[PDB]
Amino acid sequence: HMGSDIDEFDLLEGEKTFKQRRTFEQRVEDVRLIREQHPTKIPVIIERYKGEKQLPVLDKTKFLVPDHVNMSELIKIIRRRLQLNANQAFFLLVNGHSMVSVSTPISEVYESEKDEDGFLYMVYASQE
């Protein structure tokens, strides 16, 4: 009888992101200030994926990255700061996906992937 006897229930259970801490206009003004005073740097927000239990949390989520730095170098930096073991899986996701081009400047990435507010958002995880 195709599991007709089985019913579903939503199980409930019992620290804010940058977008939660700052309004859109506040973020746009931050980016304006960065563009004015640090024209060769890319504003980048890096946060831990919601629900990630393997990787620790970083002490800083807001970064200025020199234009020439590529994703491989950024991954190395973040892994070092998280103090990960060499065999630990790690992914740095931009708009939910891994970047294919890991040798190109982050400014080039920025032009494709930036948020409407002008920040570039990344999330790190031990999967995806």
Residue numbers in the entry: -16 to -3, 4 to 117
Recite the paper's sentences:
L. pneumophila inhibits autophagy by injecting an effector protein called RavZ into the cytoplasm. RavZ functions as a cysteine protease and irreversibly deconjugates mammalian Atg8s from PE to inhibit autophagosome formation. Unlike Atg4 that cleaves the amide bond between terminal glycine and PE, RavZ cleaves the amide bond before glycine. As a consequence, the RavZ-cleaved Atg8 proteins cannot be relipidated, leading to inhibition of autophagy.
There are two molecules (molecule A and B) of the LIR2-LC3 fusion in one asymmetric unit with LIR2 of each molecule interacting with its symmetry-related LC3 molecule. The hydrophobic interaction of LIR2 with LC3 is conserved and adopts the classical LIR-LC3-binding mode. The first aromatic residue, F29, of LIR2 interacts with the first hydrophobic pocket (HP1) consisting of I23, P32, L53, F108 and the alkyl sidechain of K51 and the second aromatic residue L32 interacts with the second hydrophobic pocket (HP2) consisting of F52, V54, P55, V58, L63 and I66. Therefore, RavZ recognizes LC3 mainly via its N-terminal LIR2 motif by binding to the LIR-binding site in LC3.
